[PDB]
Symmetry: C3
Subunit: 211 residues, 3 copies
């Protein structure tokens, strides 16, 4: 197809289905929506993610450490179900029947630049310094006023997991949200459970499959 | 339409028609051209802007403060004329009859991430620290040699104004140009009126409307 | 054409045909691959590059200075052969017969923002500070472990060379790869000749020709 699209998650961002991996063998559920558009072998899209303190583990200091978490967008999960590391409920491809391969990072591009994720499909956070390669986007998230969120960074990395049955590449999306020094600790067990962060749809571009 | 385009402004950058809001209640006229391409609900485009010191307020010091201004791209101005905060002299859509909705920031993504602009249509500058969310783009503009222009940042934020009659989202483009320390002050009342800056066409991507 | 594509180079990154220009009248051969997709007058694409120390100059310090080089993508080389500063073996456009003009930076945009490269076909590196305008993209390359490659910047600038026979605009790609402070010096005369670096496919967006 000339233009193909892919989407997954909840565009209303009220259903907290999506498994995010967090630093130091932690995890949290988020709500997230990803939309991708592939044309000519190049893919641009967006990712948007929200979550609230009630869902988050109570270790570290968010003000000094950042609010850090990752999700995996897994185009080949329709043929490679164990690739679904973030436990998306489903994904939609237009035109119907178009190959999800259009949305995997390019096979030639990914050779020697891909990150192999830790096996445990419930502990695959990879710190930016350990990602093999990435593209970095700068944005500003919003959230509860006492969090004093100032800025964020998204890294976009080609990835695979040994749990997979195919060679199709996945998309690792690592987030770091940064607060001003006056912000409250999102990780404090006494923090209000309803404190939340919410990103805009953050854009990215990558090379996909094509002939 | 599989691919739709939107454009507005003067690609010759000779008509100083466009209203830019500036910090601390100020404003300035600029020349500008925006071109957007929507495919699969994702829009990629460019903005390019130029002005000169004769159009600019003469307060402060550009070397220390930066040269900062904001313009609004308003796709729904065809159905919401009050949304034309930057006073564009129309826009052109291809294919003819395609809806300008395609170019508004997505309503699902914009919910809780949109910035509501100051209500007077002649003073709606928002400092980056007060935008709700944005994507940030890094670039370098050119201009008169003596300004020693070195770099630039563009924030792209979904925005709305209470003056609007429709619920369609706008695009707030906030610019900060940075000079080397030895550059001359753009804001000096005795500086030459012909001193000028000119951005490249700076690219950006965002989530539009789709079915 | 509604969507058009352009590619050049070796997607296997095994053929070191491509001429990269380096600071201080140096040069190095690299293997590289570029893919571009044009829709609506807006072009998105990627560049990916690899090389090894045996091929690089043996003065300076890469840890202090960075690994800096430039590649030119030259869409009009089908009708302006002297424009092929990076000595690509050729390029491929789809649909067949589509003009390579689609992939040249926009002429109205390129006025007064374009960099005029040095007049020498084998010596056209321009430091970031001396580029007229650009957009900057943040990524992370990989390479030999001992280099400790940490990050990279790509600057994308519209360019022309005095050696050209046409007015069709070229794309200057300037790279800076950044190492941690304990990495080995890629330029040390006694560096292992096999030390290498490899970027991901780094995406960029620009305005092309359109009607």
């Amino acid at each position: 197809p000339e233009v193909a699209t892919y989407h997954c998650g909840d565009n209303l961002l009220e259903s907290y289905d999506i498994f995010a991996s967090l630093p130091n063998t932690n995890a949290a559920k988020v709500a997230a929506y990803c939309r991708l558009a592939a044309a000519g072998g190049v893919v641009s899209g967006t990712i948007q993610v929200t979550s609230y303190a009630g869902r988050w583990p109570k270790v570290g200091n968010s003000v000094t450490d950042g609010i850090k978490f990752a999700i995996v967008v897994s185009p080949p999960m329709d043929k490679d179900p164990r690739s679904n590391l973030s436990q998306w409920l489903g994904a939609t491809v237009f035109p119907a029947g178009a190959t999800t391969a259009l949305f995997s990072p390019n096979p030639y591009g990914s050779l020697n630049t891909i990150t192999t994720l830790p096996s445990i499909a419930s502990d695959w956070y990879v710190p930016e310094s350990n990602l093999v390669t990435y593209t970095k986007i700068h944005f500003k998230p919003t959230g509860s006023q006492q969090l004093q969120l100032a800025s964020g960074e998204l890294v976009v990395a080609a990835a695979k997991s040994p749990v997979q049955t195919t060679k199709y590449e996945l998309i690792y999306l690592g987030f770091t949200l940064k607060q001003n020094s006056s912000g409250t600790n999102f990780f404090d067990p006494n923090a209000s459970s309803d404190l939340s962060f919410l990103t805009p749809p953050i854009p990215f571009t990558y090379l996909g499959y094509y002939q």
